[model samples]
Target: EVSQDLFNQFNLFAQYSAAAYCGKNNDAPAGTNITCTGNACPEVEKADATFLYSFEDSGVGDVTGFLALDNTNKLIVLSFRGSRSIENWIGNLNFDLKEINDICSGCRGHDGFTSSWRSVADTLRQKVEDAVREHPDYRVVFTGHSLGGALATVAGADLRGNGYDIDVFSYGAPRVGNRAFAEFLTVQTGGTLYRITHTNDIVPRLPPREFGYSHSSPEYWIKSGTLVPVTRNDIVKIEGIDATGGNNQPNIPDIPAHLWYFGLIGTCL
Candidate 1:
């Protein structure tokens, strides 16, 4: 029985891309209303200027929808539906880089002070909360190729703290903080989040520099891996790297393999 619910389909991926793009909370649309003192949804059509990539570069991308194989069976596929980053962290709209840096450091440190990131997390969290309240059976899982992965981590943690029980599977996600923090965060988050790594992709290690942190002992994620459940954590570890493993991250030849696969070119135009 193949089914599709257009709106709920790509929600998680939105979070993933939002994080990947580093505070890119606009671009893609179609989630529940943000309740921003108005009946209309907020202007989530533009990407944040802080992120590394811009909408002009990618356009509207894809929300992979759900997985058909084991990947789909186990989790939902929320790939970017446009060519650019479309997810947003939903709370405390005003923040400086130093604050984000501090939040990342705290999340990594496992002090449980993710409030800085939580602002954005909460904004997105409201959407998921509504989704879960309306549809309770779906196991919310978030994934993205590169930048999406980082967003997934942030969004996943937010949902987790807020009691969403979502799982995050990030592919080629750059490091969000230092090794100690990463290790501690994964540990604190109960290992429900898995950072999928490609052997040589130079992204999973670039996030910490802004916080004056660095990846010392690079952990290798093998191809063709599956996530393992960590005790008391929503984050799981998938021990094999599949640059082109399952539908999770397919190797589409000639396609840029970014979020643009979802007709972003069409939407951006």
Candidate 2:
């Protein structure tokens, strides 16, 4: 875990990227065009539609966020987006596991979670609140892979309560809390959340799924609930290399993969 000074650096990076996202002309990537009519819109290739915002954070994995069409948008159809890099929390970053655990233990105490989990969520929500306030009118969506998804879910709920009416689209998000906590969040949130998983993700099943468990099956989630499942093919990994080696190295050069959103930078809307 980084010190308050380092955490401040993370906050600055995310704030600047979010500001750029809000003020730019965000166009679809080359050769891509998005058209919409009567509440239905053409799907912009995820490649052309999303952008990755990077900032040094706990995981050294580099936190990421996205700006894409908000199915709920009324005009212009794009919204400011954001997310966090959770690799640090999961012990994937180069930081010492003991160091991170100890720091997180301290963070949990500060925020009342008895763990670092809520600290991550609280920090993420703080950024989202700042970003949404940048425009206030546009819908804000937050998505992440793995641990990032967990933070996104918590942050999204926080934003909604702030009167932002945001939508949270998480991919392969693990169960961050027990069933009651999850249910309490959904019910309190009025259901503007979309917890997603791909059959191949292998992560959604993790942290285990059991009765009274907070996690939902793709089938259970898709049935009039916020849990959305993408076919395994719809999801891809965006390979990124951390020169800092804070996160586990794929040894697979961090090239743009089906899941990576590097190309989305050009589409800044």
Candidate 2: give its CA RMSD in angstroms.
14.2
Alpha-carbon TM-score of each model against the true structure: 0.44, 0.44
Question: In model 2, where do residues sit more than 4 Å from their true spots?
Answer: 1-54, 58-117, 120-126, 210-213, 216-269
Q: Which regions of candidate 1 fall more than 4 Å away from where they truly are?
A: 1-119, 207-269
Candidate lDDT scores, in order, read: 0.35, 0.35
lDDT of 1: 0.35
Residue-wise lDDT of candidate 1 within 104-206, one digit each (tens)?
4443421111332344444344545655565466566656555455545555544455555666665555455444545444454532564544333444434
Deviation from native of the Cα of residue 262 in model 2, angstroms: 15
Clash list (residue pairs), candidate 2: 26-268, 26-269, 50-264, 59-88, 93-246, 94-246, 236-259, 238-260, 239-254
The C-alpha RMSD in Å for every predicted model, in order, reads 13.1, 14.2
Please report, as a residue range, the 10-residue window in candidate 2 with the lowest summed lDDT. Answer: 105-114
